[PDB]
């Protein structure tokens, strides 16, 4: 089928120019169809930025028209977005999409942050309970991933074996950086015998951590 | 520039109920209105195009009518899986989207399951010190968590985060995190977290004393 996939910068300074790259698989971007760039701001809001047509014509949004440029590379089968003079209001998550009878095939969407800040890797701390050998027949261990820039981070438990009883909480910005945590609930039996480990990944900084949940003293 | 308007910004609904969202064009868009579905950490998915046409793999429970200006969308029976934001957009002039209607599921009351954790050893060495506290699997969303170090209420340093509904059971889960300097943490005793939900006449209070190994 049609498989769009955007890539490119994650965090870029202000007044600078952004440049994403959407690569499509399973359909030439030169035989029928509109090839779009749509952006989704934090929360709920969608904004169609424009598109590169089959013939290679362009129709931008009358408001970003003075700042953007959508070109293509017909041999690599990829079209690219270019956002100049990026203000901090421009930070959002970007998608490339096929357009004919509505927008049909959307890309995974890559998030772009416009901040004067700097990339700082996370401090991952393991959260163990302090009170005998748990509470009931259920134990909830957790993990605090604090101080990292910018979003996102990916946390899993024991490489994905612990796929249930998991809760990952949305990050909140603590001044110039974020903090995230994630709990996991399991029975008191496979808690200290079996060993659980939270594994965090902060792509933008190429940091991958495997912190273990050890029982606090007693 | 053709403004589109979605009505119920949000809705709560039981299962088997009959949902009905509404979208409106500012100036005649004809029948070029389409509905998208956006679940947590997923890309939208086309649902209806041409104001009335369903797409592929899209279950029968989704149908759309409407023409030039007034458009709607139905769900014969809302299922747990039907939790997500619903957008619409016109593809007549320049593509402009609606405001999205966030649709949540109405389940029954369920009290949270709190669990407060003491600040990890290494973090202290690292200078800081965070007392975490999870409020898991509750409903309704409305909860108030209150920290109290040694009896006195601390409203400075706390950071709360909540999760999107469902989780196959249609409940929520909050998390509060109080962040202190080590010193300050080291000069106090009891660190209690106090959740006050409506499925509890009195508040649920978990706590720990900085003096028990």
């Amino acid at each position: 089928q049609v498989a769009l996939q955007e890539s490119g910068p994650g965090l870029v300074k202000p007044s600078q120019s952004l440049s994403l790259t959407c690569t499509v698989t399973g359909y030439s971007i030169t035989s029928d169809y509109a090839w779009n760039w749509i952006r989704q701001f934090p929360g709920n809001k969608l904004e169609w930025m424009g598109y590169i047509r089959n013939g290679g014509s362009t129709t931008y949004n009358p408001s970003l028209a003075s700042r953007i440029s959508i070109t293509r590379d017909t041999s690599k089968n990829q079209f690219f977005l270019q956002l100049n003079s990026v203000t901090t209001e421009d930070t959002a998550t970007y998608y490339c999409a096929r357009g004919g009878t509505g927008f049909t095939y959307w890309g995974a969407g890559t998030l772009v942050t416009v901040s004067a800040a700097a990339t700082t890797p996370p401090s991952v701390y393991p959260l163990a309970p302090g009170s005998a050998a748990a509470a009931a027949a259920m134990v909830t261990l957790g993990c605090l991933v604090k101080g990292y820039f910018p979003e996102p981070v990916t946390v899993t438990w024991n490489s994905g074996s612990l796929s249930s009883g998991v809760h990952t909480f949305p990050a909140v910005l603590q001044s110039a950086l974020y903090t995230l945590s994630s709990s996991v609930t399991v029975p008191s039996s496979p808690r200290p015998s079996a060993t659980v480990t939270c594994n965090v990944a902060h792509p933008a900084s190429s940091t991958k951590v495997d912190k273990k949940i050890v029982p606090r003293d007693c | 520039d053709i403004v589109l308007t979605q009505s119920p910004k949000s809705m709560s609904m039981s299962v088997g109920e009959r949902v009905t969202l509404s979208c409106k064009a500012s100036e005649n868009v004809g029948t070029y209105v389409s509905w998208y579905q956006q679940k947590p950490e997923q890309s939208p998915k086309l649902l209806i195009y041409g104001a009335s046409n369903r797409y592929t793999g899209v279950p029968d429970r989704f149908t759309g009518s409407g023409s030039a200006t007034d458009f709607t969308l139905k769900i014969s029976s809302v299922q747990a899986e039907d939790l997500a934001d619903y957008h619409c957009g016109q593809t007549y002039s320049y593509p402009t989207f609606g405001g999205g209607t966030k649709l949540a599921i109405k389940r029954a009351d369920a009290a949270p399951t709190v669990s407060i954790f003491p600040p990890s050893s290494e973090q202290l060495t690292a200078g800081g010190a965070s007392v975490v506290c999870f409020l898991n699997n509750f409903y309704p969303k409305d909860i108030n968590v209150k920290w109290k170090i040694d009896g006195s209420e601390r409203q400075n340093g706390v950071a709360n985060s909540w999760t999107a509904q469902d989780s196959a059971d249609s409940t929520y889960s909050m998390s509060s995190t109080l962040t202190l300097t080590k010193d300050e943490y080291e000069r106090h005793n009891s660190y209690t977290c106090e959740a006050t939900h409506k499925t509890s006449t009195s508040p649920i209070v978990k706590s720990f004393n900085r003096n028990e190994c």
């Binding site: 169809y33 | 004809g30 070029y32 007549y92 002039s93």
Partner: peptide, 15 residues
């Protein structure tokens, strides 16, 4: 008609 205006050199808000 299927939603092909905004694309194939056709519609576009006036003014």
């Amino acid at each position: 008609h299927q939603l092909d205006p905004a694309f194939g050199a056709n519609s576009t808000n006036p003014d």
